[PDB]
Amino acid sequence: SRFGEPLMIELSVFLCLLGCLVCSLWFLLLLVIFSGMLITHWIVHVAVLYFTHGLKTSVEVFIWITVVLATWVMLIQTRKILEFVTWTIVTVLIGAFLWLVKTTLLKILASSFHLNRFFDRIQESVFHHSVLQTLAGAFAKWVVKVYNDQAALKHALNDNKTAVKQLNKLVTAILIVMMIVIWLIVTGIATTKLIVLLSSQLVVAAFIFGNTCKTIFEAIIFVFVMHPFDVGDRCVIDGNKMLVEEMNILTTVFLKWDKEKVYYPNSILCTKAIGNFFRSPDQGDVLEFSVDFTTPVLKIGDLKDRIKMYLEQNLNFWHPQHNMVVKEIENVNKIKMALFVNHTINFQDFAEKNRRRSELVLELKKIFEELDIKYNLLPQEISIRN
Amino acid sequence: QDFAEKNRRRSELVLELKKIFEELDIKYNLLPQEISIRN
Amino acid sequence: IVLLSSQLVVAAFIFGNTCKTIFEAIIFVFVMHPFDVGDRCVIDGNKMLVEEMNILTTVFLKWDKEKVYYPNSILCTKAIGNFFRSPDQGDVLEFSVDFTTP
Amino acid sequence: EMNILTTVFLKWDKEKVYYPNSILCTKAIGNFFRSPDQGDVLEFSVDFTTP
Amino acid sequence: EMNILTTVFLKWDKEKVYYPNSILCTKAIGNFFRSPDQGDVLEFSVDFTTP
Amino acid sequence: VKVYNDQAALKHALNDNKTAVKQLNKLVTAILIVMMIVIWLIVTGIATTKL
Ligand SMILES: CCCCCCCCCCCCCCCC(=O)O
Ligand SMILES: CCCCCCCCCCCCCCCC(=O)O
Ligand SMILES: CCCCCCCCCCCCCCCC(=O)O
Ligand SMILES: CCCCCCCCCCCCCCCC(=O)O
């Protein structure tokens, strides 16, 4: 596991000049320009940071084609051949448009997923590594924590890139297919019988792949929009405290307290209430106990006072705020009580939580012995027959 | 809305009930058990 | 125009159910409006403080401050208690005494 | 209170509860207000040997 | 064995069990083979007066 | 003889994890054949439009 483990190449400038040289008069000059008009788009782009760098090339294609179609329209059985060509160009532009849309949406999703959530953890990681580099020119525990946190960020970053690439493949594939169909029908190539068969194929597919498409969509919303947890977070699902090992579109992989690896479908996880200790504020806890009904109220008062002193001597572990609650009188034999305390940590480090609680439980033991707090069973009257 | 406060007030009432039972000598006892001994 | 409309129909067929869910969540948040941020609510016996409200999810803190994310698509079908909006509340102390108590 | 989408109830300890009509309408609902005089039961036990 | 419609498993007592994949598709599945070294717990109790 | 018996055991151990693929192949092929029948009927013009 990742967590829990024990020459032509640069001839474009020249090519562009050669293309310009192609005409100096007349009507076909725009058509000729199209052959190397990409250079013009590149220059326009130069003339025109995450989105900018990632999208400029998609924009260039879109506008490039738009111009080619516009000049084509204004340029002019060759009669039917040209109708065909015109529509082919239109289809190509539609394709580029959709391409641009697709790219944009994935860039938004991919970026906002992390940029608006853990920017600050990245900066903390950089800081600590700068410090380690400087130092080189409980210390060891600190050093290990710094490396483990960096690894966690690397894993989150890689899983996001992967998930987005998977989305990219699904969308690209459907986009390509629909563009083929669009081309065939707008150009007039497909005939009535072909339209009928394509129509049927789509309808049938709509049923077959219906649940699949819905499931993927819901999984995307769960993972990227709701985002109840990240990689490495300790989460609670139906009472199971589990560490998130990996996130994917269809599944989330978790490690149980005993490090069993669990594959948990997102289509199920989407309907559950999910806890997240990593994202929690300092967490609290409870120690329940019972005392005899005859315990003097003064000993109850001494118990409260002794507990307060303990907690105040250990402020690295406990917040000063606590409550002692008397809850119930059972028969006239038992008083049920509970101690409510506040930890100075959240529970991402579960073992540390238990160690601190364990000491508090032993302190309670000690206080009861010193104050002579006891619990007795009710007496039983016996009658003897011979 | 404030649970800690609710419980503090309730705890005092529970301890008052304790006090009243002691002052009025109110008790609970288990049913007697008859034993036959065959040695 | 026809081709565009045709695909909207197909998309509806396939994703209409997720859109339905989002819409239902909108009605829960803005029309039913069972709670606000900072209120203590009771869901399935769990007394939780509302920390954040969103369209798709509600974030709550449990008594031990564990942060919990509930889909609104689930809260829409539950009965929700709200202590903030409640009038003065009552309580019970149960006990038992000997039969022979005068 | 009553509304179209949800009914609001108070429990015996007066917490206020929002209860969707979409779930409430599939439950059997008792109504004490509309009820006739109601009955009750005291259960108890005695020794077998009681004459 | 694995097939498209069903998965065949052996229980600890080697009973052969046939699961529809359509139901496994909705379950959380543990996999020991793929797991890192696993941990364990021994629970016990002692007298309160143990020093 | 041990070498050949071990070779056989290994070939089976490896082939046992590919049974789902073989099943998918049969399914895909059946679909593909049907698609080609339909294509033949249409591309040669033998089918008419009412049918
Ligand atoms: C259902 C159509 C495919 C869905 C999109 C591609 C896969 C999305 C990611 C899900 C996890 C699959 C890849 C990891 C498998 C593994 O554990 O080796
Ligand atoms: C009719 C549905 C179409 C829109 C599909 C996109 C998903 C709905 C809008 C998401 C709004 C943000 C939800 C809260 C996210 C958060 O928990 O921070
Ligand atoms: C999908 C549309 C839902 C809106 C139509 C129903 C109108 C609201 C019904 C009452 C429930 C909300 C209470 C609002 C307060 C009020 O106006 O009395
Ligand atoms: C060709 C369509 C048949 C309908 C059933 C769909 C699955 C294709 C057939 C592959 C076999 C599925 C597993 C059954 C167990 C076995 O083969 O022994």
Numbering used by the authors:
A (entry chain A): 96 to 101, 186 to 204, 222 to 244, 258 to 285, 294 to 354, 503 to 751
B (entry chain G): 713 to 751
C (entry chain G): 560 to 661
D (entry chain F), E (entry chain B): 611 to 661
F (entry chain B): 509 to 559
What's the paper's own text on this?
Flycatcher1 (FLYC1), a MscS homolog, has recently been identified as a candidate mechanosensitive (MS) ion channel involved in Venus flytrap prey recognition. FLYC1 is an ortholog of prokaryotic MS ion channel MscS (mechanosensitive ion channel of small conductance), which functions as an osmotic release valve, and is perhaps the most extensively studied MS channel. FLYC1 comprises a homoheptamer with six TMs (TM1–TM6) per protomer and intracellular N and C termini. A glycine-containing hinge (G575) splits TM6 into two halves (TM6a and TM6b), and the β-rich C-termini of the FLYC1 protomers come together to form a hollow cytoplasmic cage.
